[PDB]
């Protein structure tokens, strides 16, 4: 039980700049989908 | 991708090519198969250049074209047609009428359509500044040599 404890809280993330700049760079580029368009698709947050 | 370059009209247009040269229905085409449709458009070519133009395309080098070989030559096709002309659509966005020359009230209906808009004063001050010659429009020549309207 603890050491499933000790574990999960190790995986624990915190704020990643590298994670952050990536993240930057990628909303600004406008990305969209071939059927249709998306507007800045909104997929999962890489920071926290 | 070819999703992007092809729709799916041009996908089943591309299959019934496909299938044109493929008279077995293997999935694939030969160098007689190939060989076969370009005797029926005139062309009467020798096996030496036969292989060229099949190996020119033939991307795993098995010596036969397949389906996905053929999607991917079309593919490429569509795209190279267009190199630079991207500025030519961009002018008409700006150019509804269908002239030569960008007016101001034309840079008024392109602006209202967009999000920003403008207090129909500003709208001068930038049509001023991509027209050199001072004639109150923006040419096709003034807009690629500096896009400011
Ligand atoms: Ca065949
Ligand atoms: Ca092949
Ligand atoms: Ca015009
Ligand atoms: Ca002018």
């Given at each position: 039980?603890?050491?499933?404890?000790?574990?999960?809280?190790?995986?624990?993330?915190?704020?990643?700049?590298?994670?952050?700049?990536?993240?930057?760079?990628?909303?600004?580029?406008?990305?969209?989908?071939?059927?249709?368009?998306?507007?800045?698709?909104?997929?999962?947050?890489?920071?926290? | 991708?070819?999703?992007?370059?092809?729709?799916?009209?041009?996908?089943?247009?591309?299959?019934?090519?496909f299938?044109?040269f493929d008279?077995d229905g293997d999935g694939t085409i030969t160098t007689k198969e190939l060989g076969?449709?370009?005797?029926?458009?005139?062309?009467?070519?020798?096996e030496?250049?036969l292989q060229d133009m099949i190996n020119e395309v033939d991307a795993d080098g098995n010596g036969t074209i397949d389906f996905p070989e053929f999607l991917t030559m079309?593919?490429?096709?569509?795209?190279?047609?267009?190199?630079?002309?991207?500025?030519?659509?961009?002018?008409?966005?700006?150019?509804?009428?269908?002239?030569?020359?960008?007016?101001?009230?034309?840079?008024?209906?392109?602006?209202?359509?967009?999000?920003?808009?403008?207090?129909?004063?500003?709208?001068?001050?930038?049509?001023?500044?991509?027209?050199?010659?001072?004639?109150?429009?923006?040419?096709?020549?003034?807009?690629?040599?500096?896009?400011?309207?």
């Open positions: 039980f603890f050491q499933s404890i000790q574990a999960l809280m190790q995986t624990c993330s915190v704020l990643d700049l590298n994670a952050f700049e990536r993240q930057n760079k990628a909303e600004g580029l406008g990305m969209v989908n071939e059927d249709g368009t998306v507007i800045n698709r909104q997929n999962g947050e890489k920071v926290m | 991708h070819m999703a992007d370059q092809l729709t799916e009209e041009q996908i089943a247009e591309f299959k019934e090519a299938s044109l008279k076969t449709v370009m005797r029926s458009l005139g062309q009467n070519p020798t030496a250049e079309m593919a490429r096709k569509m795209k190279d047609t267009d190199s630079e002309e991207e500025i030519r659509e961009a002018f008409r966005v700006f150019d509804k009428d269908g002239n030569g020359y960008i007016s101001a009230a034309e840079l008024r209906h392109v602006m209202t359509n967009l999000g920003e808009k403008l207090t129909d004063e500003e709208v001068d001050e930038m049509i001023r500044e991509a027209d050199i010659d001072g004639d109150g429009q923006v040419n096709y020549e003034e807009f690629v040599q500096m896009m400011t309207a």
